[PDB]
Design a protein around this ligand. Structure first.
Ligand code: ADP
Ligand code: ADP
Ligand code: MOO
Ligand code: MOO
Ligand code: CA
Ligand code: CA
Ligand code: MG
Ligand code: MG
Ligand code: MO
Ligand code: MO
Ligand code: MO
Ligand code: MO
Ligand code: MO
Ligand code: MO
Ligand code: MO
Ligand code: MO
Ligand code: MO
Ligand code: MO
Ligand code: MO
Ligand code: MO
Ligand code: MO
Ligand code: MO
Ligand code: MO
Ligand code: MO
Lengths: 414, 414
């Protein structure tokens, strides 16, 4: 317009407030990594479902006390015992095996001495119990770990490997979860060639599409490649319409400044009839970053029109797009993790809040990590895992110094 | 045997020392996430390949100084200009467009005032240049960012989205990288049923296979599901042989203690002819953890036989298996990230080093995260992202207290 300068805080809140939560679907539990449960999950069985030995040893009657006992048989994992242990008798048990009727404690083998075995040495016949067992010792009673009817996972749970294991444990192999967003990515500019192309006069290769698609894929979300679109409103509208049809989220880069061949804001408003919530953000880099929504038949589509400069595109993707996607896939608090780190070098502050990719590293025993802004040789074998978040300068603070503590958004595996 | 108790430090070093680095393969750069480059990568073009405007404005002759200028044409992104700017003239430029012959600086539009435009207002004819340009201002010279022949990525680089973007930029769309390990996972025990099964007497559901497969998949590695194997040496040998054929790494759980129906160590040694490097580790949980290698025709297979207890299996998988896999896929320093955190609760120390899953959380402005051992309601919506690493007790230290600083291995996204 130019659009009003929007503060970072307002822009970020606006993205989260205006972004929808996707609907739900039933998935197989093996496909649950990173998904958010949209149902509570209950156990239909006890764990353990039988009284289970926690040791290799003997199932005994505690009342018998220590002494010499006839071994009447063995309880092995996976088989329900049929015999009842009577006074003066014991049954061999292994870890995880059921406790036979008549026994009320387990004595571990280390607290015993073998008296007699078969001539072939394959069968134990008589054992000395050296200790006084406590009633119930070394037995997991029925339901000790999980009770039938217990809620073991609550709706809203963001699942990792252990949650998948718990679903397996309780036999709940299909669960309701939020859908993942499908994210379409488009590059714009008459100067852009595909990565596969040799250069031609006046042209460069499109890098943003690759970088943005990889960023989204890193977070586990399905993507759509919408290719390169030229600087003209008809082609841009057609590409946006394809994105809307095929995806939940459309990410563009380029063409959002006020230049003569920058059409995206006009197309979003006048042709697409989308609602542009902000078109400029008071931030460095990322000034022309644009966020729009489009409501079609009770479905809200999300559009991020990011700056064309490659550094600006990847920075703004991490600040605005990734949290939106986290909200869409059902994460209750979709905010990124922000940690405290020490600056590895002095840095000049800008009137705008500043953001820069960095590498976070821990040093021996020092409690806080160091943040080294990207751009020793070894500090190049590693990809950026942080985004430095530097404050606006004040009449007081014009610079931050090496060692001073700053906020860093986590954007990669530490 | 019982095998010697191996210290944690020795066991860990032994895994890393004995684990091979996999060979290399050529991949498409879009498939490069998490891969390690096995070649240096060079630029074959300059970036930018032409002198490029960094602003919307006018390409000028700095020697002309400020004043009123005829606009002879426009240089738009993607088109090589044909006209030469002479004294008294300027050419309109947009960001990323080539600088025409004859011009040596760019003046941004904000430092100008328009004098004359066409009757239709679509074409600018005359402009007032308000500033004295510095030579070369607001131009990226040829090769400013990347030079032809420059090494832009070194062998050993562990790639993320920005590295993929750089490959796209320089047009190197196929790269040599280390292979990813294929990891086969097996559960053992006559008591185990599939997750899909209803319980039967004496039985429980297999959870470890799901948890371990999910853990490995979370790190991006392909997996093989070897199912459930009973407690007998013939079936175990057959399953191990299948794993060896189909995978680079075999993970088993269960059957590694000294129980009567525990055969895995015997099978690995006597039947498989593998070299067991340790069979017990002085650690809690994880005492019976076993690591073996098998060399077949110049190929080294890796076998981890983990404890059957589900908590022990997932803990030892994170401590030993994941670093091995990182080495196999070419990561030069495969050690996990360890951070410092504050204990959320008092904890009793064991003679053994202790490990427990936890959740790491940052609090407002406090520099160090808090580590809350797994097992408010909201602290259940989140999956474990840390492994607490507690020291062995000493005659002095028998307990650690809330707030004290401890080591935590990162095992999930923070
Ligand atoms: N996909 C892309 N890959 C690499 N560079 C790009 C890409 N898109 C745009 N650029 C470059 O970024 C710079 C700014 O582009 P521009 O379209 O003006 O961004 P905006 O107008 O959105 O701020 C130009 O130098 C342009 O060539
Ligand atoms: N895949 C599995 N899923 C769930 N529980 C298991 C699994 N494998 C073993 N267990 C249980 O873990 C416990 C220890 O098993 P065990 O085979 O004795 O381990 P190890 O001998 O290797 O220490 C037993 O209670 C057993 O039923
Ligand atoms: O206008 Mo920017 O600073 O390249 O996003
Ligand atoms: O023997 Mo463990 O402590 O279950 O691995
Ligand atoms: Ca452009
Ligand atoms: Ca077993
Ligand atoms: Mg532009
Ligand atoms: Mg056992
Ligand atoms: Mo135990
Ligand atoms: Mo900017
Ligand atoms: Mo910038
Ligand atoms: Mo800029
Ligand atoms: Mo700028
Ligand atoms: Mo700017
Ligand atoms: Mo800009
Ligand atoms: Mo920029
Ligand atoms: Mo710039
Ligand atoms: Mo243990
Ligand atoms: Mo244990
Ligand atoms: Mo144990
Ligand atoms: Mo134990
Ligand atoms: Mo133990
Ligand atoms: Mo054990
Ligand atoms: Mo255990």
């Amino acid at each position: 317009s130019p659009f009003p300068l929007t503060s970072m805080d307002k822009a970020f809140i606006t993205v989260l407030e205006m972004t929808p939560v996707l609907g739900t679907e039933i998935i197989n539990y093996r496909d649950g990594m990173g998904r958010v449960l949209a149902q509570d999950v209950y156990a239909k069985d006890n764990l353990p479902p039988f009284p289970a030995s926690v040791k290799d040893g003997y199932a005994v009657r505690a009342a018998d006390g220590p002494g010499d006992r006839f071994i009447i048989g063995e309880s092995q994992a996976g088989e329900q015992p049929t015999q009842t242990v009577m006074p003066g008798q014991v049954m061999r048990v292994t870890t995880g095996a059921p406790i036979p009727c008549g026994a009320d404690a387990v004595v571990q083998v280390e607290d015993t001495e073998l008296i007699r075995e078969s001539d072939d040495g394959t069968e134990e016949l008589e054992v000395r119990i050296l200790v006084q067992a406590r009633p119930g010792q070394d037995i997991r009673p029925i339901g000790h770990d999980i009770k039938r009817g217990e809620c073991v996972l609550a709706k809203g749970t963001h699942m990792g490997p252990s949650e998948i294991g718990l679903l397996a444990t309780v036999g709940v192999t299909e669960v309701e979860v939020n859908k993942f967003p499908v994210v379409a990515v488009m590059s714009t500019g008459n100067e852009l060639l595909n990565p596969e192309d040799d250069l031609l006069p006046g042209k460069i290769r499109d890098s943003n599409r690759s970088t943005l698609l990889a960023t989204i894929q890193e977070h586990g979300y399905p993507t759509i490649n919408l290719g390169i679109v030229g600087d003209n409103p008809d082609d841009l509208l057609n590409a946006l319409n394809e994105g809307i049809s095929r995806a939940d989220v459309i990410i563009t880069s380029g063409g959002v400044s006020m230049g003569e061949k920058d059409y995206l804001k006009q197309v979003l408003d006048i042709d697409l009839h989308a609602q542009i919530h902000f078109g400029r953000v008071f931030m460095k880099p990322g000034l022309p970053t644009t966020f729009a929504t489009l409501d079609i038949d009770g479905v809200r589509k999300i559009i991020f029109a990011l700056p064309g400069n490659p550094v600006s595109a990847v920075v703004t993707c991490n600040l605005f797009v990734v949290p939106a996607l986290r909200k869409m896939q059902g994460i209750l608090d979709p905010r990124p993790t922000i940690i405290k780190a020490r600056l590895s070098c002095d840095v000049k502050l800008d009137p705008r809040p500043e953001y820069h990719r960095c590498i976070l590293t821990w040093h021996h025993q020092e409690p806080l990590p160091w943040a080294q802004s990207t751009g020793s040789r070894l500090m190049s074998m590693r990809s950026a895992n942080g985004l430095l978040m530097l404050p606006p300068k004040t009449e007081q603070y014009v610079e931050l110094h090496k060692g001073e503590v700053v906020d860093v958004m986590v954007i990669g595996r530490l």
